[model samples]
Target chain A: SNAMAESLITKKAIAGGLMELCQHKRFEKISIADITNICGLNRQTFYYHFTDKYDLLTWTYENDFFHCLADGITLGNWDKHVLKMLESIKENADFYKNTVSADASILSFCFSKLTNSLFMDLFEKIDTNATVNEADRVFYAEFFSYGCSGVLIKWITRGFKEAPETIANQLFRLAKDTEFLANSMYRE
Target chain B: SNAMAESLITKKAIAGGLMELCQHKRFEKISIADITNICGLNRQTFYYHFTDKYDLLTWTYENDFFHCLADGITLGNWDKHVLKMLESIKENADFYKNTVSADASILSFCFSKLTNSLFMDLFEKIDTNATVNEADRVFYAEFFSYGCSGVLIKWITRGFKEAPETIANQLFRLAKDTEFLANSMYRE
Candidate 1:
């Protein structure tokens, strides 16, 4: 193996260890020392890769799959990306449920951050040639982002029993069938 | 006037005072002493009518308009109710805007609470004969509630430039034009 593999294994050791711990306790209650101790890594290892647990939390999800999913998205064809994200969430269903039960303050902010990026990407894809102003684009991205995330959050907190495809079907229909996508904001 | 009138005056004084303060600062930054001192009322009076600041914050909106808006809601015909709520929000745009700008943790919860009730009511109206279990109903309520509140939150945060009718149009289309409402949950 090379240095890159070593680095990745170390990172995985930290992230995977933290998630494993998250299953038993709250994210807020978990600490740097706890994570390092569990992973058999030193504190410096964590500091080198993450500013704190929160950075690690978001980084874990983003690096694990969100980045690829974000890359896969295009306007008018977002269900695949959406379903992939939901299924990924379902894959870690218990860890997520535990985090929500933990009542961590950062959870809401993290969701907003994740969804906001996806939303902006989707908006750009909607009509790359549109002449919308920055302010308007921001407004539209956040509007749809919050709405979609709100729905996604509800699904997650409710135990993720609904098939990813069911929610994805509803979302795809809502987006494709509604006037929201074809509004003036996307019109040049 | 009578004691009843005195009670009304005190309640209005507190509500009006809080709204005035909200215009200038975040709700989270506003404290008990700030609210009482602004209205020249004792803390006892504040406690007499409400549980806490958030209680008062929600009470102000509920008393001012949400209750009547809630009363006006009907299944499958919720746009009128949504439009009414938005227009009522536009009626006191600044106060609502401040709560949103303040980004208080309680703000999102409050919206979810309000929207949850509205969605439940609408569901009931949609199919009075349906025997959807409580858990399923709760799921559906929060799902639609999040989506609707997300859009409403965006509208308020954007300075209420769009007419209530415009948002109502989009929401009605989304609900009626999709399979969401036609699902087994609402079908008798």
Candidate 2:
């Protein structure tokens, strides 16, 4: 337990250092040395926690932005979580824009990972009779996640011009529509 | 008419050359020189018709794979067009795989360009009373296109194991479901 806690502490320190540096320059321009130097950590320590800056970026994104929503999110409250996530992206617009511009896969991967399970759960909720097999359920979830993540990616890259509320409403409606369609599809 | 016809001929010759080369090798390994050498065209001619290999790849994909669907697709016939397009991808698996692996944007751009108009038409058909604004319609279309394109890209990169019919069915259902939802959304 002590070692795990210590490891998290070390990782958080490194992640914080990376985030601070990201604010000053692009993710591409920021180096391991820059990250370690800012937080008074060494290369070995950085390596111990993260393999590369991108890895650290993923960790930072998951922890700072989405970790809160992971446990509490249900269909009823998922829209609030979506709105919160969008607000976080808007608040850290520079960091997100730079990371997305440098390598979108990082955010894209994290976004998909977060949404896949949520959609899966939503599908299970709607497919009460279990008419849809697990394989099809997974497919449906991936489809929606890819679609929703694409919308979010476009929003981030195009500059967060639309208010978070508007985007949230559209996304929520899409999800509700999906639920409706799934319910009808599974029904006899 | 003569000048435009000549331009089309030149573009087709270059595109065919590139396609033939793509079958044997990755798009990145195949160069303009390779294209010209294969087709008995010179460097000047290759440059005259297309700017680069990627540019040529886009033109070829658009003209060869999607041009048929652009004019013929409607709500009733769009599913057939999708199946035909997927079958074409499977039939030319090597060339499509190589180009998608090398530069997905070429295919992604062509797909979005084709579907954007199709979805817009679908939206208009659903919103007969024009309850939804043009902006929301465009947004909805883009959302669905991104989702559909994401699914297709996965199928291509993952070796196209799933039958085109299966994909076509899923896609068509999704479109119908979208139509049902939109109809309900717009209805008073």
Candidate 3:
């Protein structure tokens, strides 16, 4: 590969190796040396794309595939698109399972936090006229978004026992309970 | 001083340096050496107090400010308390008037994600309804919180021109328009 492409591949190789390493340990515990060695790059080359480990984790997901599983899903049209994307990822099955364990503790936290944040932001956009109070809206967004991630993590940990569409359907069913919906809408 | 007392002071010196650095620079930019030099502690002493820089920051906040903010404040009493704390921080502000040339970079990104995550978690505890959507609250909280921080920062940069109560009045007056009680303050 050309020198230009050389850096690019090395950067990604570092990221992939780091991702695999994440499955066994904490991100915060991993060092630059660990990631660089995994990529066969020196410290300077590692520093070229990432200022530090956190930057590498953010870069891994920021412009990456996770968002494809995320966007344009609303209460009106959520079940279809949302479930389709998640189930597809589930089909891949082991793509990212166990990557956060030995690799990056903060990445897992960031991933979970970012995904839930996405759900909250999107939920707010969808629920703007949903007849809930201001307090209730925020409360439910947190509840639903984090709940979504929590359930997905369980599914992931279980090795995707069910398709995401099925899981999404279960969530839709849960939201149908009026008492649960009203009560869970604003707890924080 | 005795070795025990000296170690305790050393512990405090490291933590103090960290707080100062957080207030002064981007957490991402500050390093172990910078912290050590700032606090006049050995580099190893930084590790001695905590495992890493993050551990240092988390320990300091949890031990000092976080618990005090949470002690008895709950949903029924939180709104005013939240507003009050912001007003107070602005009032006693002799220290935070800072521009390390990093604000330009920061303005491009979402400010609320990092700061409001803290408030979101806090809000969750104060409210137990479990169904409240947290996004709206976080959105609103970020607006109010960062707006307050920005305004205070502006004031500090310009030199404190009015009483801290003046800033609080302005905020409450502004916020009231968003409430049912005050159409005069905010309008269509």
Candidate 4:
């Protein structure tokens, strides 16, 4: 447990150094040497924790986005998670815009994974009677995740012009309305 | 007018030849020479019509998918259009699968453009009173298009395991349900 804790600390230190460098430089231009040098860590230590910068970027995203929701993602508070994520992206808008510009697929892949699981959980909660089969449930979750993630990506790439509140409200309404419609359809 | 008609015929011949070549060879392996040799056309004619094979592929996709819905994509018959598209994809499953495998973004880009405009039209139809602003309407259309196109891409890439009817029915239901929910939400 102590070793695991220490490793996480080291990783965070490296992540911090990378983000600091990102403020002044593009993500694609940054290198492992730059990261290690900035963090006062050697290449060996960097490799020990991450395969490459892309891996570290993914970890950074997961850590930043999910740390807030780890213990508080119930259906009752899901809207908060959506809002929280949008705000996080806005707050670190430069880092996100840079990293996403470096490689568009990384953010999309991570986002899809995150939203897919989140929607899967929400779908389970909505299907209280367990009437929907697993395949249909999975498909529905993926469909919504694609929609939400698409909106998120577009907002970020388009310079985050839309306020976070507007997006969160629309996404929340869509999810809830879909739930309501599904319930009625199944009842009939 | 005759020149335009003749050009259209030449392009279709080239597309047909390419599709025929695609049946036996990977899209990447097939080339302009192959297409022209198959169709009894020369390089000059091919260049006269298309910049490259990718352009021709896009033309083929649009012609095949949109020809049926060109005159009949109203809200009243949109479900039919959806079903028609799904059927078309299934009918040319091999062409879609092979072409998408060669370059994933082409299909995604074309699909997004098609669905985006379709949804834009549907949103205009729904907002009969013009209550929604143009920006919001555009955003909503894009959000829905991403979902539909994401589902379509996944279906094609995953070997079209689900029946066309199953996919089309779910999509139609989601669109109609969303429309109903939006109506109620706006009423209040």
Candidate 4 ranges beyond 4 A from true positions: A1-6, A17-47, A66-71, A75-81, A123-127, A131-136, A186-188, B1-110, B124-136, B186-188
For residues A92-163, what per-residue lDDT tens digits would candidate 3 score against the true structure? Answer: 444445533223222333444554565456546656676666555454344344334444544665677876
lDDT, candidate 2, residue A119? 82
The digit string of per-residue lDDT tens for model 4 on A61-117 reads: 878754456336777777677688688778888888877766555666567776778
Instruction: Tell me how many clashing residue pairs each candidate has.
Output: 0, 0, 38, 0
Docking class of 3: incorrect
Residue by residue across A11-44, what tens digits does model 1's lDDT show? 8778898889988877868999999888987777
In candidate 3, what are the lDDT values of residues B22-121, reduced to their tens digit? 6767666878998898887676667767887656654554444323453445556556654565454444343223321223112101222333454556
TM-score of chain B of 3: 0.47
Question: How accurate locally, in lDDT, is each candidate?
Answer: 0.67, 0.74, 0.51, 0.74
Clashes of 1: 0
| lDDT for each residue of candidate 2 in A32-68, tens digit (9 for 90 to 100) | 9998899886787788778888778878888986556
Q: Considering DockQ, where higher is better, how would the candidates rank from best to worst?
A: 2, 4, 1, 3
Model 1: docking quality category: incorrect
Expressed as tens digits, the lDDT of each residue in B160-182 for candidate 4 is: 99999888876676566545554
Q: Whole-model lDDT for model 2 versus the true structure?
A: 0.74
- Model 2 stretches astray by more than 4 angstroms: A1-64, A67-77, A98-110, A124-136, A186-188, B1-10, B13-54, B102-106, B125-127, B131-136, B186-188
TM-score of chain B of each: 0.75, 0.87, 0.47, 0.85
State residue B20's C-alpha deviation in candidate 2, in Å: 4.6
- Computed on C-alphas against the true complex, the DockQ of each candidate is 0.21, 0.40, 0.04, 0.37
In candidate 4, list every pair of residues with a backbone clash. Answer: none
